[PDB]
Amino acid sequence: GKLPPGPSPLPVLGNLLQMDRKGLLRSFLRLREKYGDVFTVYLGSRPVVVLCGTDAIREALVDQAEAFSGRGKIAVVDPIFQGYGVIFANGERWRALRRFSLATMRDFGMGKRSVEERIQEEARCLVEELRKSKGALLDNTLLFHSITSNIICSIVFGKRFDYKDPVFLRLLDLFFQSFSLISSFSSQVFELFSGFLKYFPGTHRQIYRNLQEINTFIGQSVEKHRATLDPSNPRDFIDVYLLRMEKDKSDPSSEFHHQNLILTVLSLFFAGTETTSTTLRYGFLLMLKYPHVTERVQKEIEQVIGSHRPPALDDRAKMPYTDAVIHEIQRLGDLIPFGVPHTVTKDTQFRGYVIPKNTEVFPVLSSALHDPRYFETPNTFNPGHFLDANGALKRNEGFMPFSLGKRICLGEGIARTELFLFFTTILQNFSIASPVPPEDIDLTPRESGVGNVPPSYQIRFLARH
Numbered sequence: 001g002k003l004p005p006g007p008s009p010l011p012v013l014g015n016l017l018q019m020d021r022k023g024l025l026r027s028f029l030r031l032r033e034k035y036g037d038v039f040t041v042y043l044g045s046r047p048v049v050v051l052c053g054t055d056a057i058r059e060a061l062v063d064q065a066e067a068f069s070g071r072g073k074i075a076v077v078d079p080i081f082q083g084y085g086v087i088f089a090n091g092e093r094w095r096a097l098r099r100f101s102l103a104t105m106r107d108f109g110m111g112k113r114s115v116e117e118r119i120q121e122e123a124r125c126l127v128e129e130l131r132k133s134k135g136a137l138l139d140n141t142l143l144f145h146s147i148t149s150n151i152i153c154s155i156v157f158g159k160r161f162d163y164k165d166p167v168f169l170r171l172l173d174l175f176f177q178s179f180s181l182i183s184s185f186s187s188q189v190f191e192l193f194s195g196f197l198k199y200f201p202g203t204h205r206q207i208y209r210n211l212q213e214i215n216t217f218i219g220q221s222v223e224k225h226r227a228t229l230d231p232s233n234p235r236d237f238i239d240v241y242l243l244r245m246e247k248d249k250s251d252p253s254s255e256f257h258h259q260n261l262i263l264t265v266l267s268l269f270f271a272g273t274e275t276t277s278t279t280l281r282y283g284f285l286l287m288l289k290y291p292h293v294t295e296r297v298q299k300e301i302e303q304v305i306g307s308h309r310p311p312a313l314d315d316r317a318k319m320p321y322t323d324a325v326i327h328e329i330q331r332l333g334d335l336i337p338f339g340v341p342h343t344v345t346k347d348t349q350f351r352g353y354v355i356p357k358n359t360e361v362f363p364v365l366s367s368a369l370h371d372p373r374y375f376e377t378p379n380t381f382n383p384g385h386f387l388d389a390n391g392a393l394k395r396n397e398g399f400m401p402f403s404l405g406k407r408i409c410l411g412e413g414i415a416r417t418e419l420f421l422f423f424t425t426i427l428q429n430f431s432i433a434s435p436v437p438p439e440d441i442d443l444t445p446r447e448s449g450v451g452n453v454p455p456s457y458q459i460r461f462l463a464r465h
């Protein structure tokens with residue numbers, strides 16, 4: 001009849017500066033061990049419910065799907081205004097964002113050319129590019145960001161970029177390069193007081209460069225498309241925009257808004273490719289640790305796909321072992337350990353407790369991905385987790401990398417497709433190696449960030465013959 005049990009928000013002088021997973025995990029584990037699978041922790045004076053393990057998470061996201069279908073909130077984590085929710089002042093801006101997001105999402109699933117085909121084309125170009133390395137040790141970060149990003153570029157501009165095209169490299173840099181922001185508590189307060197909120201990284205110097213060349217490219221590309229536009233046959237998304245602009249008679253202010261909102265949406269699409277990239281990077285790090293598994297996968301590729309044709313999405317149905325391996329990669333990859341926050345849409349009764357309407361809830365996906373109740377070896381790579389006695393693919397309750405229920409990842413489809421095609425196409429044409437012996441491969445993620453990302457590592461792709 002009350003909120004789940006948990007620690008008190010007090011004392012206030014109890015260091016409101018929690019900043020690190022190595023210590024947040026320690027705290028998380030302690031709380032779960034003491035209060036159970038469902039507890040409440042406070043962010044400032046804000047109650048946040050935490051769900052642990054496969055059972056609790058599915059009972060909420062699935063069994064009471066509607067109740068737990070509310071969107072999470074963006075809360076201040078700093079000691080000042082700690083816990084306060086932050087929102088856009090104009091509710092319409094938000095609704096417009098959701099609208100364009102969905103519309104654009106629908107448009108990308110259209111066209112004569114399928115996404116699978118573009119991913120195959122990209123996989124082909126990746127193979128060729130890797131060959132040029134003649135097996136030298138390299139950091140696959142740039143190329144893995146490149147292959148997922150190029151799919152969006154292909155869809156938008158009509159064709160992919162060459163990996164070394166300056167515009168493309170500046171684009172990858174704009175979205176994924178880390179930059180340093182220098183400021184004091186006082187200077188940040190002063191900015192807000194002056195009416196400015198600069199949240200994203202990049203000083204004039206840093207970003208003005210990339211951005212300037214990028215805009216020029218977009219400008220002229222929109223120009224070329226317009227000069228050769230065929231209303232009967234839209235080639236790509238730029239055409240779709242030009243056509244869906246016919247009779248868009250609106251003042252400069254409103255025109256600006258429509259245009260910039262599209263760019264903002266495309267930006268989110270680009271950022272989203274990072275989850276797939278990271279999963280691929282984690283996957284290959286894992287393959288380095290298990291050379292024999294990698295070989296089995298290559299063997300299955302040989303049996304089903306052969307070596308005279310590129311892998312196709314429908315080949316996955318006949319490749320249970322590789323499928324199982326990819327599942328393990330996502331499971332152990334554990335990209336979003338804490339899950340994405342939700343809110344209950346009404347006072348909700350859950351396992352004897354009452355979660356007030358609008359309360360934030362975190363389904364800790366990591367605690368499910370490593371659930372000893374459903375995975376025989378929760379902390380060890382094991383394809384058996386998804387295979388029956390006859391080696392056929394089988395599902396596992398603990399597997400929920402894309403989350404579950406009504407808010408399940410809208411991109412799970414394209415992500416799975418890219419994972420499969422990139423993973424199999426690469427291993428079909430290459431074997432991999434590292435100075436670091438298998439038994440010494442460390443799967444520990446970077447200490448920074450909210451998600452799990454493999455730290456930089458060296459790997460070599462040996463062309464097969």
Ligand code: HEM
Pocket residue numbers: 269272273275276279335336339340341342401402403404406407408409410411412414415
């Ligand atoms: C291996 C890759 C990916 C993983 C593991 C993943 C994971 C997730 C997870 C766990 C959520 C939160 C679900 C919840 O609220 O409970 C989420 C949401 C979402 N993802 Fe992904 N994602 C991936 C790829 C993608 C891609 C490629 C896109 C974009 C095209 C994308 C778009 C979204 C969107 C729009 C949502 C919010 C959905 C909603 O609340 O209704 N994701 N994703």
Ligand SMILES: OC[C@H]1O[C@@H](O[C@H]2[C@H](O)[C@@H](O)[C@H](OCCCCCC3CCCCC3)O[C@@H]2CO)[C@H](O)[C@@H](O)[C@@H]1O
Pocket residue numbers: 156218219222223237238241259262263266
């Ligand atoms: O004085 C106005 C100047 O406008 C420049 O930019 C044009 C561009 O040529 C024209 O393409 C643009 O509309 C399209 C760009 C807006 C974003 C469209 C998005 C579509 C999806 C992919 C990302 C871009 O409108 C701009 C004007 O509002 C023109 O280049 C100049 O020639 C013209 O003199």
Ligand SMILES: OC[C@H]1O[C@H](O[C@H]2[C@H](O)[C@@H](O)[C@H](OCCCCCC3CCCCC3)O[C@@H]2CO)[C@H](O)[C@@H](O)[C@@H]1O
Pocket residue numbers: 007008009010011014018024027028041048050338362364
């Ligand atoms: O509130 C009183 C307690 O404060 C400290 O414990 C804190 C820890 O310092 C603090 O690190 C911990 O943080 C818990 C919240 C973060 C982990 C739980 C979830 C947060 C949201 C994302 C998913 C995980 O909360 C504990 C309980 O509040 C002190 O260490 C305790 O001695 C004291 O009893």
Ligand SMILES: OC[C@H]1O[C@H](O[C@H]2[C@H](O)[C@@H](O)[C@H](OCCCCCC3CCCCC3)O[C@@H]2CO)[C@H](O)[C@@H](O)[C@@H]1O
Pocket residue numbers: 071072073074086087088089090091092094095197199
């Ligand atoms: O249509 C108005 C909507 O208002 C609320 O939605 C919130 C959303 O829950 C809330 O997530 C959203 O936040 C705005 C986007 C997140 C902040 C982004 C900025 C954070 C600081 C750095 C710059 C970016 O604001 C919306 C209101 O403007 C209500 O919850 C919705 O039910 C209602 O539909």
Ligand SMILES: OC[C@H]1O[C@H](O[C@H]2[C@H](O)[C@@H](O)[C@H](OCCCCCC3CCCCC3)O[C@@H]2CO)[C@H](O)[C@@H](O)[C@@H]1O
Pocket residue numbers: 097098099101102268406407
């Ligand atoms: O037609 C209504 C649709 O509602 C949901 O789709 C939502 C998704 O639930 C919802 O996640 C999505 O949000 C679009 C904005 C994405 C987040 C943007 C923020 C990211 C973090 C920084 C601030 C901005 O908008 C979609 C389209 O409205 C349902 O999931 C869909 O099934 C349903 O078709």
Ligand SMILES: c1ccc(-c2ccc([C@@H](c3ccccc3)n3ccnc3)cc2)cc1
Pocket residue numbers: 018019020021024041042043044048077338449450451
């Ligand atoms: C209740 C109590 C505490 C928290 C909490 C929220 C965030 C963090 C902390 C964090 C650190 C590492 C992984 C995930 C989150 N953080 C700080 C800035 N951005 C993320 C630590 C704790 C959330 C709810």
Ligand SMILES: c1ccc(-c2ccc([C@H](c3ccccc3)n3ccnc3)cc2)cc1
Pocket residue numbers: 153156171174175211214260263264266267
């Ligand atoms: C293909 C399609 C779009 C883009 C693109 C390029 C730059 C931006 C640009 C941006 C600027 C800085 C960081 C991220 C994106 N933006 C965002 C909102 N309005 C402008 C957005 C999108 C790049 C390639």
Ligand SMILES: c1ccc(-c2ccc([C@H](c3ccccc3)n3ccnc3)cc2)cc1
Pocket residue numbers: 101102265268269271272273274275409411
């Ligand atoms: C339109 C298109 C895409 C999105 C979008 C929404 C959320 C994210 C968000 C994400 C945010 C930043 C980097 C990588 C991913 N995410 C995480 C898991 N699944 C998605 C990325 C993109 C929003 C609107």
